[PDB]
Amino acid sequence: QALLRILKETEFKKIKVLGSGAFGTVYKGLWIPEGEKVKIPVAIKELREATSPKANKEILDEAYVMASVDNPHVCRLLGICLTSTVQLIMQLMPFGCLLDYVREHKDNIGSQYLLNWCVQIAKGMNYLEDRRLVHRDLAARNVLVKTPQHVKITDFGLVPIKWMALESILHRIYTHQSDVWSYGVTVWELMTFGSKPYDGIPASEISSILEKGERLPQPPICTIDVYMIMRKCWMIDADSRPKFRELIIEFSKMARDPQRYLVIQGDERMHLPSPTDSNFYRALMDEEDMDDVV
Ligand SMILES: CN1CCC(c2ccc(-c3ccc4c(c3)C(=O)N([C@H](c3cccc(F)c3)c3nc5ccccc5[nH]3)C4)cc2)CC1
Ligand SMILES: *CCC(=O)Nc1cc(Nc2nccc(-c3cn(C)c4ccccc34)n2)c(OC)cc1N(C)CCN(C)C
Numbered sequence: 001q002a003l004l005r006i007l008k009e010t011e012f013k014k015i016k017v018l019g020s021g022a023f024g025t026v027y028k029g030l031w032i033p034e035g036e037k038v039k040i041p042v043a044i045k046e047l048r049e050a051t052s053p054k055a056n057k058e059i060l061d062e063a064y065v066m067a068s069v070d071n072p073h074v075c076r077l078l079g080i081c082l083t084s085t086v087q088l089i090m091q092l093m094p095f096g097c098l099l100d101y102v103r104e105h106k107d108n109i110g111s112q113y114l115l116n117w118c119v120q121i122a123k124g125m126n127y128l129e130d131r132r133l134v135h136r137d138l139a140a141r142n143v144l145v146k147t148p149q150h151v152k153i154t155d156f157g158l159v160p161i162k163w164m165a166l167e168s169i170l171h172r173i174y175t176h177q178s179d180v181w182s183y184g185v186t187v188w189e190l191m192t193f194g195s196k197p198y199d200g201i202p203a204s205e206i207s208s209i210l211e212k213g214e215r216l217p218q219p220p221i222c223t224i225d226v227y228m229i230m231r232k233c234w235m236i237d238a239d240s241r242p243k244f245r246e247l248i249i250e251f252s253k254m255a256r257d258p259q260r261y262l263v264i265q266g267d268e269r270m271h272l273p274s275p276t277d278s279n280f281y282r283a284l285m286d287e288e289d290m291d292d293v294v
Contacts, residue, residue: 004067007081014044022158024048043092047085056082072290073124075154095145103194110270111262115255116293117151118187124153125183126244129176136174138182139163140189147286149293161203166210166236177238184233191219223261255294
């Protein structure tokens with residue numbers, strides 16, 4: 001219970017709306033420690049509804065779990081303010097979500113970032129599986145960018161039909177193997193630089209298209225090796241889909257040599273940060289003990 005700090009309304013302020021997500025609106029905010037003069041940027045989620053003391057017990061019970069995750073690629077809940085409409089606090093990611101990031105640097109990211117992102121998302125998901133926590137809403141929008149070299153998964157354990165496995169659409173079954181399905185769509189989002197999956201198709205017909213056997217198409221920058229992993233994530237039998245621990249190894253193998261698995265125009269004119277630049281980013285923005293990029 002020492003991982004979730006109970007906050008007062010007077011020690012933080014919302015200053016700008018960042019967007020809208022699960023159970024409420026997310027703001028960029030400022031934390032002002034009691035008796036201090038500093039202003040610390042934070043992220044604040046204010047629920048879209050009023051709550052009662054009783055429901056706040058269900059909230060705090062889940063909030064203690066959400067604050068107990070410890071992995072470089074999983075976001076941790078930091079605090080909560082039980083003010084009628086509950087307010088949650090986590091670290092603010094200045095680079096935004098990976099979905100917006102990949103759209104904004106479209107066709108200009110490079111293969112080595114993309115593959116390492118897949119490695120890091122799989123590391124976080126494999127961590128959640130080790131904790132026996134199902135995400136249930138993995139998507140590019142829920143992958144935050146701490147630095148361009150370091151992403152973290154957020155908002156797990158809380159309808160996105162076009163990301164859900166077939167057994168989740170048909171029977172609301174959410175397992176770690178259905179998280180693998182959503183991971184496949186998330187990678188598809190990254191390889192298409194943020195395209196909307198099954199765009200233009202009504203949600204009510206998605207289950208039919210999956211039962212008929214059709215899947216999202218192969219991105220032009222993807223070799224067949226990459227598309228196959230995506231397709232193996234979308235097999236109808238959940239236990240036939242790959243494990244997150246296997247996805248880590250496979251995308252790490254492809255990251256040890258990126259240009260053979262992604263075909264991008266100008267890829268050599270990009271490249272990952274030099275160690276000099278990597279140490280600069282980390283001393284300013286990312287002091288965590290993350291492993292390393294491939
Ligand atoms: C009858 N009634 C039905 C529903 C009700 C209820 C309502 C809310 C939560 C609940 C309880 C706890 C969390 C969330 C949501 C929720 O959305 N969370 C995100 C999360 C999850 C995991 C890791 C992580 F870093 C963050 C998250 N996004 C943020 C954005 C900005 C600031 C803070 C943020 N916090 C944590 C549980 C039950 C109680 C019973
Ligand atoms: C994908 C939408 C998005 O996340 N946009 C931005 C997020 C920023 N930081 C941040 N830090 C912590 C938590 C969140 C967060 C969590 N959830 C569930 C959200 C839902 C909707 C919106 C944000 C959410 N976000 C951020 O830092 C300043 C900026 C952005 N924006 C607006 C775009 C990114 N880029 C232009 C800077």
